């Protein structure tokens, strides 16, 4: 067990990052001593890895500060009307074109389909209001079927997950 905890911490500690958000999430994981907390913070780390991958792949800034769409636009210099409250995973403003990105994982096709529609509708509900201030929205929905990512190798991903779940048991 102490050996297993040392293993997953060794695996994660070697994951090199370039931003305060992923750095902070590593710290959150590496200080935990209780299995449920190690599991929760480890799984949260993998989820952030997926967001960062999705942002990189789609040319978006990662929304690491949980900005709403109003804040995203304001930070760029743009005033908004009243909007539904939406905190996307990534964004990019190029001229008057705003990309908003949401990513998720669903391993079952029916669930994938439903979640895809839910996330699409969450962003689409912004379109008309954004158009009223001459912003054209492109909603990007990056649905995945797994937690495999380009941030850590798949074998590390599996080993980390397998070992964290095994710690809940003793
Ligand atoms: Mg999010
Ligand atoms: Mg998401």
Author numbering: 1 to 170
What's written in the study?
Using an ambisense coding strategy, LASV genome encodes four proteins: glycoprotein complex (GPC), nucleoprotein (NP), matrix protein (Z), and the L RNA-dependent RNA polymerase. Instead, these viruses steal the caps from host mRNAs in a process termed cap snatching. In arenaviruses, mutagenesis studies have revealed that the N-terminal domain of the LASV L protein, which consists of 250 amino acid residues, is uniquely required for viral transcription but not replication, implicating its potential role in cap snatching. Our work confirms that arenavirus L polymerase proteins contain a conserved endonuclease domain at the N-terminal region.
Toward this end, we report here for the first time the crystal structure of the endonuclease domain of the LASV L protein in complex with Mg2+ ions at 1.72 Å and demonstrate its enzymatic activity required for viral RNA transcription. The final protein product for crystallization consists of residues 1–173 based on the structure determined. The protein contains an N-terminal domain that consists of a four α-helices bundle (α1, α2, α3 and α7) and a C-terminal domain that composes of three antiparallel β-sheets (β1, β2 and β3) and two helices (α4 and α5). Between the two domains is a highly positively charged groove, which we speculate to be a RNA binding site, and a highly negatively charged cavity, which harbors two magnesium ions (Mg2+) and is a potential active site of the endonuclease domain. Two Mg2+ ions, presumably picked up by the protein from the crystallization solution, are located at the presumed active site of the LASV endonuclease domain. Four water molecules (Wat1, 2, 3 and 4) and the side chain of D89 coordinate the first Mg2+, while three water molecules (Wat4, 5 and 6), the side chain of D89 and the main chain oxygen of C103 coordinate the second Mg2+. This metal binding feature is different from that of the known structures of the influenza and LACV endonucleases, in which both metal ions are coordinated by four or three potential catalytic residues or by residue E80 and three water molecules. In addition to D89, which coordinates the two Mg2+ ions, some other potential catalytic residues are E51 that coordinates Wat1 and Wat6, E102, which is 4.2 Å away from Wat4, D119, which is 5.2 Å from Wat5, K122, which is 5.7 Å from Wat3 and 5.8 Å from the first Mg2+, and H62, which interacts with E51 through side chains and is 6.2 Å away from Wat1. Structural comparison demonstrates that LASV L endonuclease closely resembles the L endonuclease of LCMV with rmsd of 1.382 Å over 166 Cα atoms. However, we notice that the active sites form a deep cavity in PA endonuclease but a flat surface in LASV endonuclease domain, which may partly explain our failure to obtain the LASV L in complex with single ribonucleotides despite multiple attempts.
